[PDB]
Design a protein around this ligand. Sequence first.
Ligand code: HEM
Ligand SMILES: CC(C)(C)OC(=O)N[C@H](CSCCC(=O)NCc1cccnc1)Cc1c[nH]c2ccccc12
Length: 458
Amino acid sequence: SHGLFKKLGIPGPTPLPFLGNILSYHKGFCMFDMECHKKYGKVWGFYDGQQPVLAITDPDMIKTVLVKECYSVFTNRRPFGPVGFMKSAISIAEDEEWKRLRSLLSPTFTSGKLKEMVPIIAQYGDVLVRNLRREAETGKPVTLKDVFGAYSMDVITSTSFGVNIDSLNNPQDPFVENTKKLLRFDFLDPFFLSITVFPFLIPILEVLNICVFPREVTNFLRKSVKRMKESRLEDTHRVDFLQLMIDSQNALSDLELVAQSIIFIFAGYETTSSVLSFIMYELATHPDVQQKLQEEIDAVLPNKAPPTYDTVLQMEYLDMVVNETLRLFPIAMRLERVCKKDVEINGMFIPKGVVVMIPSYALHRDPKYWTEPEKFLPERFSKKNKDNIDPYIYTPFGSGPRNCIGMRFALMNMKLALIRVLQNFSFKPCKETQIPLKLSLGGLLQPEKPVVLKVESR
Ligand code: HEM
Ligand SMILES: CC(C)(C)OC(=O)N[C@H](CSCCC(=O)NCc1cccnc1)Cc1c[nH]c2ccccc12
């Protein structure tokens, strides 16, 4: 097992028995990835316990796996942990099961569908400024994660389900409470450290019904969504996510409906608020850019005009800012696909069962692609420069048919928030503000201490 890469002629850190190369994650595993790049070059291998994982950095080879050969060989991600009824969630499903889920759910974010969500979010656009406005008065610092979290939440519930829960009215909300308690993925947390390293214990916990959210958060939402379904089940309106799954129960199912709902609620809450917090951090430690964006917004939307679908896409510099923030903090860290048969991609033999890994975080910081890769430089994404940029190196949303199904909704939502927040306020560091920011070594791409900034009226 541990002789695969030495035999296949592929370089790597020498694994230990049982552990594999586990102990190298103490640094945080984005750093591990970095080092390996710099040390081993353009392809390397390592072992998550007894699981061989082959990292790849070549743009062609990446394209092959993410795009050309997705259907035939590289179809699924690495088996998650114990997931019980969540095994049917789109992000976790495999093969035939996945293909249908993907085609059935993709019509949720289209040219028209997103368009229909603007006026709805717009209400929470309003409700956010009004939240901040009262802290803007007081003067003592603000945790963005929380204010953004509450926004994110409102926007996901109301769009997917057409259910206003007005979480911005509520630093006392059941939903954000249970939903945030959802993940325990810390690399250096006792739990998952034991699974990829005892992967044969997964089949066990499944029997026990012990989950990565043991019965609590899911029981909540189980009957929670059971609640939303029935109201709609009679009262006629809008054809939405909730609805599109009632359209296909005319070959979908009940626990199956609940599962995608959860995936969405998590994604829409956590991804969105986390990134939005990194963007505000940057705008504060880079005042020039904050002002320059505040100019773009004012010019396109004069007299603090309400943002819209088409005005949003008009904003070049906004987009540059978003893309640049994502270059630095590509929240997935790594893209992964399991090799489901013996294969040869661009000259290299890859054996069945191997996990092929793309280290987004590291490629986003590769000194051999990006001048001053540590520095936050939005201009590197201008129309002049936006085309020297390999879409198989810069991949914050993955690529190919298994890429981020939420991408377009993510961008609009985020931007829709930024616009409204920057046309009413400015943002500046204080002496809680960690300069420069530090990522936690724990498995998530998080700031180790929360992001806290000062908010002034305009
Ligand atoms: C800025 C926020 C976000 C980032 C950076 C992001 C990034 C990603 C990335 C990189 C992948 C995997 C791509 C690949 O492996 O090739 C992904 C998968 C996915 N994302 Fe997004 N995402 C974001 C927001 C969202 C939102 C708001 C939703 C809600 C709809 C969403 C739903 C999904 C689903 C369901 C998958 C698995 C796709 C599949 O297996 O078919 N994500 N996310
Ligand atoms: C645990 C559960 C079922 C609630 O969600 C997951 O599937 N877990 C993964 C890890 S969650 C943190 C990753 C992150 O910061 N956001 C990335 C993301 C999440 C959701 C949608 N779009 C982007 C979440 C996950 C689902 N599919 C993935 C593919 C690659 C990497 C992570 C994920």
